[PDB]
Design an enzyme around this catalytic site. Structure first.
Site, PDB file in Angstrom:
ATOM      1  N   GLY A   1       2.578   6.248   9.640  1.00 18.43           N
ATOM      2  CA  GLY A   1       4.013   6.189   9.385  1.00 18.43           C
ATOM      3  C   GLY A   1       4.648   4.906   9.899  1.00 18.43           C
ATOM      4  O   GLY A   1       5.734   4.526   9.445  1.00 18.43           O
TER       5      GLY A   1
ATOM      6  N   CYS B   1       3.571   1.858   9.379  1.00 14.70           N
ATOM      7  CA  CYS B   1       3.436   0.742   8.443  1.00 14.70           C
ATOM      8  C   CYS B   1       4.826   0.269   7.998  1.00 14.70           C
ATOM      9  O   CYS B   1       5.714   1.084   7.836  1.00 14.70           O
ATOM     10  CB  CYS B   1       2.563   1.116   7.251  1.00 14.70           C
ATOM     11  SG  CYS B   1       0.897   1.674   7.693  1.00 14.70           S
TER      12      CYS B   1
ATOM     13  N   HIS C   1       0.810  -1.222   0.000  1.00 13.20           N
ATOM     14  CA  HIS C   1       0.000   0.000   0.000  1.00 13.20           C
ATOM     15  C   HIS C   1       0.857   1.292   0.000  1.00 13.20           C
ATOM     16  O   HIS C   1       0.286   2.378  -0.065  1.00 13.20           O
ATOM     17  CB  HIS C   1      -1.080   0.024   1.093  1.00 13.20           C
ATOM     18  CG  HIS C   1      -0.597   0.317   2.478  1.00 13.20           C
ATOM     19  ND1 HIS C   1      -0.460  -0.690   3.415  1.00 13.20           N
ATOM     20  CD2 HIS C   1      -0.301   1.497   3.066  1.00 13.20           C
ATOM     21  CE1 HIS C   1      -0.042  -0.098   4.524  1.00 13.20           C
ATOM     22  NE2 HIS C   1       0.071   1.214   4.364  1.00 13.20           N
TER      23      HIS C   1
HETATM   24  C1  LIG Z   1      -3.110   5.426  10.508  1.00 11.51           C
HETATM   25  C2  LIG Z   1      -2.494   4.155  11.034  1.00 11.51           C
HETATM   26  C3  LIG Z   1      -2.346   3.955  12.404  1.00 11.51           C
HETATM   27  C4  LIG Z   1      -1.833   2.760  12.866  1.00 11.51           C
HETATM   28  N1  LIG Z   1      -1.443   1.762  12.061  1.00 11.51           N
HETATM   29  C5  LIG Z   1      -1.573   1.942  10.743  1.00 11.51           C
HETATM   30  C6  LIG Z   1      -2.101   3.102  10.180  1.00 11.51           C
HETATM   31  N2  LIG Z   1      -2.376   3.178   8.795  1.00 11.51           N
HETATM   32  C7  LIG Z   1      -3.496   2.678   8.229  1.00 11.51           C
HETATM   33  O1  LIG Z   1      -4.346   2.053   8.854  1.00 11.51           O
HETATM   34  C8  LIG Z   1      -3.645   2.976   6.750  1.00 11.51           C
HETATM   35  C9  LIG Z   1      -4.451   1.911   6.045  1.00 11.51           C
HETATM   36  C10 LIG Z   1      -3.812   0.934   5.291  1.00 11.51           C
HETATM   37  C11 LIG Z   1      -4.546  -0.107   4.763  1.00 11.51           C
HETATM   38 CL1  LIG Z   1      -3.740  -1.294   3.778  1.00 11.51          CL
HETATM   39  C12 LIG Z   1      -5.908  -0.213   4.962  1.00 11.51           C
HETATM   40  C13 LIG Z   1      -6.538   0.772   5.705  1.00 11.51           C
HETATM   41  O2  LIG Z   1      -7.881   0.679   5.984  1.00 11.51           O
HETATM   42  C14 LIG Z   1      -8.122  -0.276   7.028  1.00 11.51           C
HETATM   43  C15 LIG Z   1      -9.472  -0.930   6.724  1.00 11.51           C
HETATM   44  C16 LIG Z   1      -9.818  -0.557   8.154  1.00 11.51           C
HETATM   45  O3  LIG Z   1     -10.663  -0.907   8.970  1.00 11.51           O
HETATM   46  N3  LIG Z   1      -8.780   0.294   8.245  1.00 11.51           N
HETATM   47  C17 LIG Z   1      -5.828   1.838   6.230  1.00 11.51           C
END
Ligand SMILES: Cc1ccncc1NC(=O)Cc1cc(Cl)cc(O[C@@H]2CC(=O)N2)c1
Ligand SMILES: Cc1ccncc1NC(=O)Cc1cc(Cl)cc(O[C@@H]2CC(=O)N2)c1
Lengths: 304, 304
Positions: free
Chosen positions: B143, B145, B41
């Site tokens: 950040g 990830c 992603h």
């Molecule tokens: C901001 C943050 C804070 C902590 N750890 C990670 C993040 N980042 C994300 O979560 C970004 C993201 C990447 C993907 Cl691949 C899918 C996403 O949607 C999922 C579906 C659902 O539910 N949420 C979102």
């Protein structure tokens, strides 16, 4: 989102861990530049620990009696000296892995990471707080002496703790890197008791701010209080008196959440008086006091 | 004595953390040999995350669009490929700090250390468990990830987790180092819910053994139970059914304490049915399930 008892990355400290042997005793040493720091009780036999005279005991020791080993290589000892409760073994080789470092004496209520070690090898890392009674609730076994506590500011490691002993209560006692014990403890196998351990109020409040930032808001109420009224409640529950300095340090967290410190104090008052009622806060069924306001801000913002 | 949620020393993993930028998005990568692994992603814009077609999105990307930075030095990308939900960026330089490593897919209930990172820089380390619902209750922000989960066997690092996303529930989801998600999660910004998260019974029991080894014995009673009777109680409280394999794995802990597994199960039964009554176990007011029997043995014995 999420809130964990997070330790600093330990790599800079692993590169400093060495094994120090003196006769029969093996413990950990910290190798920074051409000096290895370790607890002076490494020179004691089991009979000596009951009432040791370290000055006399150190006199029966020469540079060659101190075996320092970093990984599989033996360090050559060219000097030895006692500074309070730590021995400083001057070696002929500077640690090529020495990070930028400082020796700091932390305040009770402040936190730090511990790199528990055995035979100069790191086994694990955990986050601790220096308790108001100057003990640490760590996880240490025999051989863990010489394991250090530290903080990291970008590239600078501030060494604040060296593990020396466990009290019969299962809590731990040790020194700063100048060999001065935190608290009234002495490096002698004699009955030593830790005084009353109070709860670090400013840390509990910082953790209540972390809970609000992470969605846990059930405990937020429609009440407020004053510093004096809150402290009447804090004393009853063996909590550290909250001062204006603590209110000030909570400021950035209060600004982020938009919840005045005295409003958070009122929530804490009700939690103290009424308990959690079977509920949890950040996955904990008790009030956590081992996160400073700095730990909360840095974890909730992302400081690397 | 003492029992803490201990993480593995993170040094071997810090030496692998890199920053991967693709257009506007910056996340962490894992550099082992001449390959950087990161969440796929990274190639998505905020509009793409709603319904991404990663195969089509990756086609608009060339080796030069992937900026890999290890410390202050730029790595030259000579290849790129998608393996499930991870991108593998072949670089022209092998990581000189690559430790002995394995890619393992851990089982739910097993634990691991996480090295939370931002911009390829480690910020902290904590111990996690893969929940039975395949989520992790971590501490991650935007950040983070690409931050990895791992275990260490003497000198070998077993990478088991790569962080990809946070669910609206504040729990975390990610993949193994082959890009396969743990659980039913997909790397798409769409409403995804974590199923019922049960308690890891074998881990709670292992922690009750850790408590007994560390002096906390108040919960030990004069009762016993059977696997079937205990499991009737475990199901009521959303606890994983205890099997003979779990009884077997508890064996070394049962042998050390001299307390039969079914006797410990009876104590756990009463704790489930009656609660803690305001008491604590290893400083916790709830039953802890994030220590495997291996974690307990290794912490209570001193495995480095
Ligand atoms: C901001 C943050 C804070 C902590 N750890 C990670 C993040 N980042 C994300 O979560 C970004 C993201 C990447 C993907 Cl691949 C899918 C996403 O949607 C999922 C579906 C659902 O539910 N949420 C979102
Ligand atoms: C076995 C272990 C486990 C965890 N951490 C450390 C250790 N080691 C010790 O505690 C050995 C020791 C060193 C000194 Cl300098 C004084 C000692 O007596 C204090 C006095 C009191 O109380 N206990 C004991």
């Amino acid at each position: 989102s999420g809130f964990r008892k997070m330790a600093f990355p330990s790599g800079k400290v692993e590169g400093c861990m060495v094994q120090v042997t003196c006769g029969t005793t093996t413990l950990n040493g910290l190798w920074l530049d051409d000096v290895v720091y370790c607890p002076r009780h490494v020179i004691c036999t089991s009979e000596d620990m009951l009432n040791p005279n370290y000055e006399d005991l150190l006199i029966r020791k020469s540079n060659h009696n101190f075996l320092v080993q970093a990984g599989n290589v033996q360090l050559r000892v060219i000097g030895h000296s006692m500074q309070n409760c730590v021995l400083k073994l001057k070696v002929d080789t500077a640690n090529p892995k020495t990070p930028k470092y400082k020796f700091v004496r932390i305040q009770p209520g402040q936190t730090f990471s511990v790199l528990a070690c055995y035979n100069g090898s790191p086994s694990g890392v955990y986050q601790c707080a220096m308790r108001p009674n100057f003990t640490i609730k760590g996880s240490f076994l025999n051989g863990s002496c010489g394991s250090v506590g530290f903080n990291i500011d970008y590239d600078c490691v501030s060494f604040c703790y060296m593990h020396h002993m466990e009290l019969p209560t299962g809590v731990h006692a040790g020194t700063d890197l100048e060999g001065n014990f935190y608290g009234p403890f002495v490096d002698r196998q004699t009955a030593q008791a830790a005084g009353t351990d109070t709860t670090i109020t400013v840390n509990v409040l910082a953790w209540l701010y972390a809970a609000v930032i992470n969605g846990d808001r059930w405990f937020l109420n429609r009440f407020t209080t004053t510093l004096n009224d809150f402290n009447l409640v804090a004393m009853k529950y063996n909590y550290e008196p909250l001062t204006q300095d603590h209110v000030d340090i909570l400021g950035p967290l209060s600004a982020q959440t938009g919840i005045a410190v005295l409003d958070m104090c009122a929530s804490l008052k009700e939690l103290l008086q009424n308990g959690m009622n079977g509920r949890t806060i950040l996955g904990s069924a008790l009030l956590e006091d081992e996160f400073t306001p700095f730990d909360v801000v840095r974890q909730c913002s992302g400081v690397t």
